Design a protein around this ligand. Structure first.
Ligand SMILES: OC[C@H]1O[C@@H](O[C@H]2[C@@H](OC[C@H]3O[C@@H](O[C@H]4[C@H](O)[C@@H](O)[C@@H](O)O[C@@H]4CO)[C@H](O)[C@@H](O)[C@@H]3O[C@@H]3O[C@H](CO[C@H]4OC[C@@H](O)[C@H](O)[C@H]4O)[C@@H](O[C@@H]4O[C@H](CO[C@H]5OC[C@@H](O)[C@H](O)[C@H]5O)[C@@H](O)[C@H](O)[C@H]4O)[C@H](O)[C@H]3O)OC[C@@H](O)[C@@H]2O)[C@H](O)[C@@H](O)[C@H]1O
Ligand SMILES: OC[C@H]1O[C@@H](O)[C@H](O)[C@@H](O)[C@@H]1O[C@@H]1O[C@H](CO[C@H]2OC[C@@H](O)[C@H](O)[C@H]2O)[C@@H](O[C@@H]2O[C@H](CO[C@H]3OC[C@@H](O)[C@H](O)[C@H]3O)[C@@H](O)[C@H](O)[C@H]2O)[C@H](O)[C@H]1O
Length: 386
């Protein structure tokens, strides 16, 4: 099955966040940034909630020896986790995540403390390391069917203090890295030649992607390729900045404004406009898009808790409705922080992994409602049964 054929069956998505991407050196990294060892039962609960795909952020460079070889015991554990999903018919998007910045930062600056432009020696060295890693991953997973997708990077040059204002300059470098990932995977043949691969836009940012990373710059023609962006607007509601205290947003959507802490931008029309840009640039050209991460903070607040809860629901509804309508699959960012739900600061957690159950009910009702209201667009060249 090709990218269009799988895409229509992939929504909605969910992330195994703060799990296999944690930057620890051992298997114990899995429970370093969140408490719960992954099990089949937990994945079963993700499926039972209604998710059809799981993005598995994963670190690999941090799990490698000095010769670049990925620890065999780490590889085997990642495979077990992937298998929990495949056992359930869940689509998996397996990435190489921030991974201590080895390419996400140092592929684009020679310094982590200030912007220092990279040169050809840097770029070619990062290409080779990227291909090394992805050769190892691809070969381990070669006999996996179309349920397994690979995503080469995470959020290339997203680090604002280093890279803001350098997107035009850096996007050609990212194109080279995306191409190197695809080349390495495809070379391993077998199911890897037919697998759908996911390449990331500049800073996983919609505006920069549709500007600088037009479809003609992608490493393959349409068929077995998707494009990934992330979506965290407005940050004070979603949790990326100024997201607690007086600047925070608790209420989102006009129907949901209250006494204070109202969103002042980034509401439904903004979201729809942004997702439309992705339709124009990518999905209308046969490249399905994944919103590989999105979230809203579910909080406990002193003010109108019902209106906050409704805002969380409505945000998840809008993301998933509008994504579906535009040929986009959205993946909820979920780090298994149940405690934060019981504070003003909030949490984006939906699944209480320790109890294999949904705890973020507003968010999850919103996911379900949004997917039900959406209408996936089909881009076909032959008849399908439908
Ligand atoms: O050790 C990590 C390293 O991180 C660098 O930052 C990069 C790294 O961020 C990790 C956060 O990821 C974020 O999701 C990303 C997502 O991966 C991206 O794709 C993109 O979308 O952006 C988002 C946002 O950055 C997660 O949502 C976020 O939780 C991750 O943060 C790590 O969280 C661990 C778990 O704690 C969190 O959830 C549990 C809650 O109860 C906590 O409230 C909440 O913080 C943290 O591990 C825990 O660490 C504490 C000790 O640290 C704490 O106290 C000292 C402070 O300095 C620390 O900031 C604070 O966290 C332990 O006691 C506990 O046992 C342990 O579980 C972990 O520290 C934290 O980083 O990857 C994404 C990149 O974009 C980031 O640049 C930092 O730059 C580097 O300095 C270093 O911290
Ligand atoms: O009623 C207000 C307040 O009154 C005090 O007198 C009392 O001590 C407080 O408990 C109470 O605050 C609510 O507390 C409940 C939990 O209550 C139990 O534990 C504490 C005891 O003191 C109570 O007697 C017990 O019944 C909170 O409910 C929990 O809320 C979380 C988080 O909810 C949010 O995130 C998930 C989302 O789906 C929700 O809609 C959203 O509100 C839930 O996961 C949990 O199931 C639920 O028990 C309540 O939020 C406090 O206001």
């Amino acid at each position: 099955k090709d990218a269009q054929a799988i895409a229509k069956d992939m929504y909605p998505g969910w992330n195994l966040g703060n799990t296999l991407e944690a930057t620890g050196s051992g298997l114990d990294a899995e429970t370093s940034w969140q408490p719960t060892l992954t099990t089949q039962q937990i994945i079963d609960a993700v499926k039972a909630a209604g998710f059809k795909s799981v993005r598995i952020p994963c670190s690999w460079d941090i799990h490698s020896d000095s010769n670049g070889e990925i620890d065999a015991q780490w590889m085997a554990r990642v495979k077990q986790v992937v298998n929990y999903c495949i056992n359930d018919g869940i689509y998996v998007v397996l990435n190489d995540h921030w991974d201590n910045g080895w390419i996400e930062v140092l592929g684009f600056s020679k310094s982590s403390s200030s912007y220092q432009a990279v040169d050809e020696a840097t770029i070619t060295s990062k290409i080779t390391r990227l291909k090394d890693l992805w050769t190892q991953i691809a070969n381990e997973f070669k006999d996996y069917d179309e349920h397994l997708l690979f995503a080469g990077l995470n959020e290339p040059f997203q680090e604002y203090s280093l890279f803001s204002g350098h997107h035009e300059e850096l996007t050609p470098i990212l194109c080279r890295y995306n191409q190197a990932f695809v080349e390495a995977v495809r070379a391993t043949g077998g199911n890897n030649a037919q697998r759908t691969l996911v390449v990331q836009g500049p800073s996983t940012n919609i505006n920069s992607s549709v500007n600088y990373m037009t479809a003609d710059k992608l490493p393959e023609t349409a068929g077995r390729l998707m494009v990934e962006v992330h979506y965290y607007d407005p940050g004070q509601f979603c949790g990326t900045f100024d997201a607690s205290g007086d600047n925070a947003f608790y209420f989102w959507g006009a129907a949901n404004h209250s006494t204070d802490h109202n969103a002042t931008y980034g509401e439904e029309a903004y979201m729809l406009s942004q997702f439309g840009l992705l339709k124009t640039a990518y999905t209308s050209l046969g490249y399905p898009v994944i919103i590989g991460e999105y979230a809203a903070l579910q909080r406990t607040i002193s003010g109108d808790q019902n209106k906050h809860n409704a805002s969380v629901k409505y945000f998840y509804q809008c993301v998933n409705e509008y994504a579906t309508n535009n040929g986009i699959i959205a993946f909820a960012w979920d780090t298994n922080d149940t405690n934060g739900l019981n504070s003003e600061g909030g949490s984006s957690t939906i699944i209480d992994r320790a109890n294999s159950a949904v705890v973020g009910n507003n968010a999850m009702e919103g996911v379900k409602a949004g997917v039900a209201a959406g209408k996936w667009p089909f881009l076909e060249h032959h008849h399908h049964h439908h």
